Amino acid sequence: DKRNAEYRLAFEQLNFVGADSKTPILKSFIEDKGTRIDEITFESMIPIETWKSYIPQLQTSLNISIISIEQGASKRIVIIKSMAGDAKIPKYLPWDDKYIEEQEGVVVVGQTFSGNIKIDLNKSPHILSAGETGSGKSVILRCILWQLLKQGAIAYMVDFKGGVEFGLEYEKVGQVITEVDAAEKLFKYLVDENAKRLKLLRESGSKNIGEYNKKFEGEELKRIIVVIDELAELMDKTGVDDETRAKLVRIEGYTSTLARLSRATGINLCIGVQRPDAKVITGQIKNNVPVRICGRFADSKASEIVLSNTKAKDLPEVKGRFLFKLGADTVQFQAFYFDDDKHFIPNKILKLR
Numbered sequence: 416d417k418r419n420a421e422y423r424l425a426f427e428q429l430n431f432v433g434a435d436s437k438t439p440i441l442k443s444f445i446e447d448k449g450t451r452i453d454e455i456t457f458e459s460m461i462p463i464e465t466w467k468s469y470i471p472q473l474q475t476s477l478n479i480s481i482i483s484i485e486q487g488a489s490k491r492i493v494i495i496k497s498m499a500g501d502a503k504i505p506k507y508l509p510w511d512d513k514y515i516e517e518q519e520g521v522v523v524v525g526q527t528f529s530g531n532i533k534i535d536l537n538k539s540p541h542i543l544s545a546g547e548t549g550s551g552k553s554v555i556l557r558c559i560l561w562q563l564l565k566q567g568a569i570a571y572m573v574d575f576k577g578g579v580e581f582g583l584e585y586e587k588v589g590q591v592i593t594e595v596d597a598a599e600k601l602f603k604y605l606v607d608e609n610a611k612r613l614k615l616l617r618e619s620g621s622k623n624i625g626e627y628n629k630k631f632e633g634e635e636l637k638r639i640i641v642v643i644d645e646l647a648e649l650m651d652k653t654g655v656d657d658e659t660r661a662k663l664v665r666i667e668g669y670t671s672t673l674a675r676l677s678r679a680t681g682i683n684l685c686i687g688v689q690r691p692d693a694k695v696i697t698g699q700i701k702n703n704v705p706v707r708i709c710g711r712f713a714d715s716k717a718s719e720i721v722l723s724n725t726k727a728k729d730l731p732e733v734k735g736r737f738l739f740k741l742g743a744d745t746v747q748f749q750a751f752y753f754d755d756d757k758h759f760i761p762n763k764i765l766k767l768r
């Protein structure tokens with residue numbers, strides 16, 4: 416076997432042997448095909464602290480990037496989490512307007528092993544982006560927003576922290592909703608706008624708003640993008656009073672209806688979540704929000720709430736490194752770093768008269 420012959424030679428060149436004079440024994444090599452992260456298990460008498468001292472050398476000899484080395488069941492077992500030197504993705508990928516797609520409704524979120532990650536909002540209409548504060552979870556949503564604003568979409572932005580996440584420059588290109596009263600008015604409007612669009616599709620025999628628009632020269636329905644900076648501000652009802660709770664229940668009813676029924680109507684939800692919790696990322700959100708973007712979470716439960724697998728615990732500690740899940744596959748990718756100070760140019764959008 417190639418791998419066993421390759422490891423043996425590598426260990427012998429280092430005289431990397433235990434008290435019994437044996438080089439480490441390969442017990443198992445488990446590759447994750449989507450993330451390209453491997454679990455290599457070795458048996459030897461070499462202490463874990465010695466393996467850790469050898470990390471720089473083992474990376475070079477075996478041609479791998481070592482994420483971690485941990486002791487297994489016994490002091491004879493080491494488990495290495497690694498990525499092959501061939502599984503290359505950037506560690507920094509600045510946004511650039513050259514990535515903007517010609518096809519309306521198609522957005523790019525970053526780079527994977529073979530090509531870029533593209534999302535066609537006409538096929539997978541809603542996105543949930545989850546990550547710890549500073550991960551880049553929110554940066555991705557603003558990058559998607561910019562792309563859609565450049566394709567002529569209408570935007571609505573929700574931020575209950577006084578709108579500090581969507582400053583005055585965002586207000587030039589759309590409406591910023593900063594409190595629960597304005598959010599009830601917004602979501603009741605979007606649910607009615609969705610109902611009016613479904614009515615137009617049935618009546619005209621149109622599959623989507625794109626087919627509808629071609630039928631009427633002077634009647635052009637535009638894509639609507641709704642960016643929710645933090646889903647917990649709309650879903651977490653724990654400490655509010657009776658009236659605010661009923662208002663949030665009404666809003667949740669509107670969000671659920673929107674997510675489930677806005678597939679063909681060109682109304683897209685881009686949701687941010689800082690702390691995954693089953694009360695916030697419910698079964699209704701999961702059943703109707705197909706795109707998941709997940710940052711690193713050391714906790715298994717947090718990854719299962721977002722992805723319904725534990726792979727977010729395996730990611731390397733790289734800023735802007737995420738998991739992408741659409742359907743049954745989970746892949747690792749580097750997200751674009753979109754910086755408002757240099758990438759968000761409101762006058763370019765306003766010029767699209």
Ligand SMILES: OC[C@H]1O[C@@H](O)[C@H](O)[C@@H](O)[C@@H]1O
Nearest residue numbers: 445446447452453454725726
């Ligand atoms: O990389 C292969 C496997 O390694 C294991 O350590 C992880 O828990 C799995 O999520 C992963 O699929």
Ligand SMILES: OC[C@H]1O[C@@H](O)[C@H](O)[C@@H](O)[C@@H]1O
Nearest residue numbers: 527530531532533534739746
């Ligand atoms: O469809 C465009 C891209 O997005 C996803 O379907 C996959 O994760 C990528 O491998 C693909 O290149």
Ligand SMILES: OC[C@H]1O[C@@H](O)[C@H](O)[C@@H](O)[C@@H]1O
Nearest residue numbers: 590592597600601602604605
């Ligand atoms: O926030 C709700 C309001 O949003 C505006 O953008 C729409 O034009 C109004 O019709 C709607 O009532």
